[PDB]
């Protein structure tokens, strides 16, 4: 109400919300635009996910550092402006190459392929970097200062941000469809790009204000390769390190949300509305996670929540494996059951480890460690992204699921070890 709406705790609740939705939308849009040009194959457009992984996976630590180095206002403005400009340029070039010229021959083994690939992949790198940086340079840092010394509300805000993310992630494609309907390829691109400009412009003033509000944020304290090395050594030392690893390990499992399990599940295609119902069940589990986390966090020690969520995950995965076991329709239904209960457990778990990383890290080293946490998540996600190929055969797409379950077990056991090495071995 009124004040509450102009309470910074919410203002940000939008600023980040505008960034999430818009960014996801742009990403999906470009993805479709590409696959529309060259038939989605092993090499065509498949390169895109891979290069976006690699980019951040290598560059994160140094972003996060530079963040830590500079101011708060200035760095946030640079992160936003850059992203906006990048998206704008990308859309412009896309339209230009969409209209004027669509297939010409150059010299020195150069074709609209090599040329557009280089230009758009540079644009993609820029945009992705912008989004992923505008996060550790704003999200985790702002949640730590805006929240204040007080926890309670900080954790509530973290859960709220996790929810919004799940919503946007499940609302971006839907909007992209309606955008195909009227917007199409020739104009649709131009529209979402101009929008992003508007979104970016608004976010700029929003954050200027939020900073005007809680004044704490004015307070602070081979060169790139050296910086990356320093960030990695800093991340290995921290006592939280163990749990951090656990987090990334979970980003390894393939079965979950939309991926190869969904691709093999789409093959069966129960019915057109059946897929929508499955998507709704997923989103529900994702949200019903954050509530569970908040409750447990209140009722039992934070470290303790993690272990419990872990048992939960593992249990639903018992379901999944015994399903594929088919021992003494069915198995398919069970697969989604498992992915779902997994979703709830997993999302709690993430919320905890996020809070850990959020408080047990010195002020100055805030960026670098979150940066590295990204990179590790991407590195562990790369294996799952590299697991799409080399065994894309959905025939024995059961042993790969067993391997994912094994990795999950490893991560959970690592988190259990961290917990024991933290509180008394008695729970």
């Amino acid at each position, epitope marked *: 109400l009124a004040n509450y709406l102009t309470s910074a705790k919410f203002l940000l609740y939008l600023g980040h919300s505008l960034s999430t939705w818009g960014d996801r939308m742009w990403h999906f849009a470009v993805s479709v635009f590409l696959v529309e040009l060259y038939g989605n194959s092993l090499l065509l457009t498949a390169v895109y996910g891979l290069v976006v992984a690699g980019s951040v996976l290598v560059l994160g630590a140094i972003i996060g550092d530079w963040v830590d180095k500079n101011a708060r206002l200035k760095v946030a403005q640079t992160s936003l402006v850059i992203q906006n400009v990048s998206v704008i340029l990308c859309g412009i070039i896309l339209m230009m190459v969409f209209l004027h010229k669509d297939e010409l021959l150059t010299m020195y083994h150069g074709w609209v392929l090599t040329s557009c690939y280089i230009l758009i992949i540079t644009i993609a790198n820029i945009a992705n970097l912008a989004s992923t940086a505008t996060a550790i340079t704003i999200q985790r840092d702002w949640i730590v200062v805006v929240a204040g*010394e*007080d926890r309670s509300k900080l954790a509530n805000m973290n859960a709220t941000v996790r929810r919004i993310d799940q919503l946007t992630n499940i609302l971006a494609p839907m909007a992209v469809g309606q955008i195909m309907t009227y917007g199409s390829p020739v104009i649709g691109c131009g529209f979402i790009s101009g929008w992003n400009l508007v979104s970016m412009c608004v976010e700029y003033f929003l954050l200027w204000k939020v900073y005007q509000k809680t004044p704490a944020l004015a307070v602070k304290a081979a060169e790139p390769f050296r910086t990356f090395r320093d960030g990695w050594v800093s991340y290995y030392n*921290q*006592p939280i390190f163990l749990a951090g690893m656990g987090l990334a390990f979970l980003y390894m499992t393939v079965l979950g949300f939309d991926c190869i399990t969904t691709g093999y599940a789409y093959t069966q295609g129960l019915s057109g509305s059946v897929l929508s119902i499955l998507m709704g069940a997923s989103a529900i589990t994702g949200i019903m996670g954050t509530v569970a986390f908040t409750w447990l966090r209140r*009722k*039992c020690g*934070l470290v303790r929540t993690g272990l419990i969520s872990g048992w939960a995950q593992i249990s639903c995965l018992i379901l999944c494996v015994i399903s594929v076991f088919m021992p003494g329709i069915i198995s398919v239904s069970l697969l989604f059951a498992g992915v779902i209960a997994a979703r709830i457990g997993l999302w709690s778990f993430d919320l905890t480890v996020t809070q850990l990383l959020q*408080e047990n*890290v010195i002020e100055s080293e805030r960026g670098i460690i979150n940066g590295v946490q990204n990179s590790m998540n991407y590195l562990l996600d790369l294996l799952h992204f590299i697991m799409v190929i080399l065994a894309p055969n959905p025939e024995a797409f059961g042993l790969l699921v067993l391997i994912s379950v094994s990795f999950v077990v490893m991560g959970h056991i690592m988190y259990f070890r961290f917990a024991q*090495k933290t509180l008394g071995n008695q729970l």
Partner: antibody, heavy 120, light 108 residues
């Protein structure tokens, strides 16, 4: 101005109980973990345990798990340590300290210290 | 448990001298070591956390260095407000342990 003021200067026949208090001022006991530390006469610092005032979770040093009970009251904004079955060895200065995370880099603010004398 | 060790109980120094106090873990702490100074009849105050960071408001002549297992506090150009006790705490893992301390003393 953040302070932690402690009850002071208790003298206790051995085998009894005693409860030592640590009252915070300028911050919320609930946003922190509260640690108890013991400094024997001419000896090094020793850690007794912490309590999470929100849910009341306590962790102790295995050599204090028998005869130390850390409790807290957020309403009064104060933390307590109960020592039971006292002996001659218990005489020391007890400190109350304030840490932010499970792995906060430091104890920024400390209690003034409470001399406890166990003799007959 | 990690048993922090300070070999020297005493260090005989003089004003304007660089004195280096050493602390040695029993396991790989990493950079999880902070440095407290306490004067007789007082509470320990921070100097240096995470083995290199200098807490906000302590003079610029207190330096901290080291990693892994062997750490060092370093007083450059010691003054007469520095004669005290120093000890290293490790927060790598619970139970926390403190260094047994190292008392400075002006040298005659």
């Amino acid at each position: 101005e953040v302070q932690l003021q402690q009850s002071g200067a208790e003298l206790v026949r051995p085998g009894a109980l005693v409860k030592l208090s640590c009252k915070a001022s300028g911050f919320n006991i609930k946003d922190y973990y509260m640690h108890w530390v013991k400094e024997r006469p001419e000896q090094g610092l020793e850690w007794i345990g912490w309590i999470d005032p929100e849910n009341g979770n306590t962790i102790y040093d295995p050599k204090f798990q028998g005869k130390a009970s850390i409790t807290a009251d957020t309403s009064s904004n104060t933390a307590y340590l109960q020592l039971s079955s006292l002996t001659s060895e218990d005489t020391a200065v007890y400190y109350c300290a304030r840490k932010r995370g499970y792995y906060g880099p430091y104890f920024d603010y400390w209690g003034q210290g409470t001399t406890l004398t166990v003799s007959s | 448990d990690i048993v922090m060790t300070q070999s020297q109980k005493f260090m005989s120094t003089s004003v304007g001298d660089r004195v280096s106090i050493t602390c040695k873990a029993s396991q790989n702490v990493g950079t999880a070591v902070a440095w407290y100074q306490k004067k007789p009849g007082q509470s320990p105050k921070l100097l240096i956390y995470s083995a290199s960071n200098r807490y906000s408001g302590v003079p610029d002549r207190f330096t901290g260095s080291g990693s892994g297992t062997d750490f060092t506090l370093t007083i450059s150009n010691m003054q007469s407000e520095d004669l005290a006790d120093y000890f290293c705490q490790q927060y790598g893992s619970y139970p926390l342990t403190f260094g047994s301390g190292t008392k400075l003393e002006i040298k005659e």
